[model samples]
Target: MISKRLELVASFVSQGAILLDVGSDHAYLPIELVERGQIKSAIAGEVVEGPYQSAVKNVEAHGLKEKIQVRLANGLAAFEETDQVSVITIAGMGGRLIARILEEGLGKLANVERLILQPNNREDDLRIWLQDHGFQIVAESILEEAGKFYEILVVEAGQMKLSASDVRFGPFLSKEVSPVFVQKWQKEAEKLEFALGQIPEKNLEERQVLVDKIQAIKEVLH
Candidate 1:
């Protein structure tokens, strides 16, 4: 009862780690991981009331209400230090929102070790946030599903310097250059190329920025 993206995120979880899944809509990830004996226990957090109840029911349906605690709260407000949450999965949201959650919950993360994030878009901004906050990107995965592409970032508590290219096109992803990565960039480059033509010639600043962005994409692609 997990998505390919969520499955990829789950694969990053360390064995015996206590999991905290923020924005856990239906608690599928927590249920699956616990049933597999992958994680010791989990906290499934949902911000909205409706989804929160649904998640609670889903956990109870699996008789995992004891193992997986579904809470109705926003962001990391769902868990406490006493929960001993060692791993966190914040998937199926924009990168900026995920970054915001991390920032707001900064105090709640001392005991937490790993973060498995699957951002729907704006990965560059997310990478920038991670870099600034001293989170190290240890692993990355890219997949195209049903005509949409998803990027999963596995981060740990550490520090690393990232160049503009590294922040924009994941350090590990750019180095590996998987087929999905190539396809994603190719399509994005094509769209940017098309947008470049629509810009007015008088808009030199905007045109130059677009040109540079397109050039960067080409450089990375080749």
Candidate 2:
């Protein structure tokens, strides 16, 4: 079984879709989907040798070598145009690296129809990258697992016009406003407020930035 984090990620994927699961730690996500017949095929990409071997062994162990390809490659190097990948999922990575990977793998994305990204942090950066590059967010999700908040983004080929609030807090997730999401921002705003209180009047520029940051969060919460 995949973790709750991955399960939420999988829920966004369509039936019989092909997947490229980057940062595939142990191939659990693809293995779960393929065995359950939720997806047609998948490539689990891993940079590290040990996890790559683990994925290979696990796929063979479950006898799903054909359905799931375990690739020992970094970022988006796991597949090519010939693979006809429909969806690309990069999870559990920092948003900056995720953006870098997407930027570097632009050629391989021609045939890809959708992207499911779950950045551990800096979701705003990822969202900005997508927006600036013509990938509008089609869906957004916020879930809590083991006291950690995860933001899942479902994006497709299009342009996006994002405001400051939309970039800071998700455009769609801001509407949902689940308790978990609200609490996450509330705590963050509190920290920002605390940080602002500590700064000296001499640091007016820094103070203004934090003040704006706090207002952005408050606007979402308000």
Candidate 3:
């Protein structure tokens, strides 16, 4: 079963999309997509042993071994460039890590068209990565589920020049200003304020950095 958050990820995948879903734990998301007729085939790549084995077992149990291939590989090693995957979905990981995966797998992504990324935090870092690397943001979705805020970014290979604030706040999400967006930034502001308390006021540079962070959050909240 996929979480409501995962459902959003699946919804972004185009019909007949061939997905390389990195960090796919039990392959639940891809299995659901395949079963629901969203994507025809998926390569669920899991780096960890337990989850890799779990994914393999589940794929067999569901009788979808031919439609979904579960691989025990790290990052983007699960598929090659020849696969010509249309969609690459990486979810439930840190933004820095996700960007690193894309960075290391740049060669394999030459043929990929869309990127469905769900970085748990630090999305600005990921968005910046996309910009510097010739990827463009096309769409975004924000939602609150299970007391946590999740953002889904859908991007394609092209030119998308984003400003500093655009990268931090998201180009599309900033315009939407949905309730979940407000809630996420407000929670982040609260946390940053708490961190600001622990810092010495006279630490000019560090204090200014936190101040800038809060200010940016305020700019987005507005």
Candidate 4:
């Protein structure tokens, strides 16, 4: 009952982690992990009532009510410092939204040892945020499920310095250059190329911006 994306997200979670799953949706990942004895326990938080109710029902249906607490909370309010949550997982959202959540919950992350984030877009901005917040990108993965490409960043509490290319393409991902990574960037470069080619630029400044974007992509692809 878990998606491929959620499966990969779950795989990054360490065994016996006290997990706080933000935007838990139906609590599928927590249920699956608990059933498999992967995590010690999980607090599945959902802001919307509809999904919150679904998460509670699903957790009960799996007979994991004790192990997984379904909370109708926003951001990181699902757990407290006493919960001793060791891992935080935020998935199926934009990079900016994820960043906002983390930013708002900055004080709640004292005990969190790892953050597994799967942003639908703006991965670069998310990486930049992580670096700025002292969350080092220790591992990264790119995969294509159906027709979409998803990037997962596994971050830990540490200091880091990412270069321009590192911020854009990811420190580990750009170096590895997986097939799905190349595919995603190639498509992006093509779209930027079309804008630079067909769209009439009113000013050279805007034109140079697109040119530089394409140039960066080319450098990475090579």
Candidate 5:
């Protein structure tokens, strides 16, 4: 079974669409999609040799070789225009890496319609990158799995033209603060505020950034 976070990500995938999962560790998402008949086909790409072989093993074990293709390639290099892939998911990597992969693989994106990204950190950076590159966040979901918090971004090819604050704290997320969302931000704010208290004012720019983040969180909390 896939984790709740990934399961939520899978729910956004349209029926009968082709998907490409970058950095697919064991091809669990693709296998699940195929088994459930939610997707017609999928490409699981793995850069590391171990995970690449493991993905192949898992695909064979599940007897999904006919529906899912296991590819050994770095980032989005495995895709082609003829593949007819619609939705692309790149999870389990840092936001910066995800942004870099998307930027480097611009050619492969022309055929893609939706991009589902889950960044481990620097999520703000990833959001900014998407906005700057003509992508709009259609939906956002947050979930906690195994003691880690994750944010999933559902993006389409277009520009919504968001502001700096929108990029810092997700426009949708900031506006719709559920009980869980408030709690998460509160905890994060406390942590940042406490960290700032320990640093000397002489640190200048870095300290100011932390202060700004703390203030931003405080503003949202009230």
Candidate 6:
């Protein structure tokens, strides 16, 4: 069984869509998808040599070499125009790097139908990048794994804009605040509040930014 985080991400993937898992370390997600019969075919892309080899080994170990192709490529380089991939997942990376990879590989995205992104940090930046590029945020969820929080984004091709506040706290997630989501943000708010209180008033600009963030969190939490 896939971990809860990956299962949540996989839930957004349309049935039988060809998938490519970028930065696929050990090919776990693709292996899981293939094992679960969720995808017709998949490509596991890893740039580093060790992880690329590991992906190959794992795919072969699962005897899914025919169903899942392990490729040694940077970012989205493993994809081709004829691939007809509908869902592309770029997880296990920082939001800024994810955005950079997406920006660089956008030319290959026309054939792609959906994106499942889970950014480790700076998720707001990733959201802004998606909005600017004409992608609509369809769904979102938060997961805490191994004592760290992750934000998963499910986006489809379209033109939908989001505000700064929306980007800061996911437009859909904030509006549909479940008890779990609320509690997660409540903890984050308390942490930010403590950090804000620690800053000296002499640093006016930094203080203002922290104050604004705290206010934004407060607005959503209530």
Model 5, 25-83: lDDT tens digits are 69999999989999999999999899999999999999989999999998889788888
Which tens-of-lDDT digit does each residue in 103-137 have in candidate 4?
99999896788999999999989988988888899
* Candidate 1: C-alpha lDDT: 0.92
TM-score of 4: 0.97
Per-candidate TM vs. native? Answer: 0.97, 0.97, 0.94, 0.97, 0.95, 0.94
| Deviating ranges (above 4 Å) for candidate 5 | 201-206
lDDT of model 1, residue 16: 99
- For model 6 the TM-score comes to 0.94
Q: How well does candidate 3 match the true structure in TM-score terms?
A: 0.94
Error of 4 at 163 (Å): 0.5
Error of 5 at 178 (Å): 2.5
Considering summed lDDT, which 10 consecutive residues are worst modelled in model 1? 1-10
Question: Which lDDT tens digits does candidate 3 get at residues 30-149?
Answer: 899899888889999999999999999989989999999888888988899777789999999989999999998888786898999999988989998889998999999998998998
With candidate 6 superimposed using the best TM-score fit, by how many Å does residue 68's alpha carbon deviate from the native? Answer: 0.9
Off by over 4 Å in 6: none
Residue 214 miss distance in model 3 (angstroms): 1.8
**True lDDT of residue 44, candidate 1:** 93
| Model 1 residue pairs with clashes | none
Which ten contiguous residues of candidate 5 have the minimum total lDDT?
Answer: 174-183
Q: How many steric clashes between backbone atoms does each model show? A: 0, 0, 0, 0, 0, 0
Worst 10 residues of 2 by lDDT: 104-113
Please give, for residues 71-117, the per-residue lDDT of candidate 1 as tens digits.
Answer: 88899999999999999999999999999999999988877989999
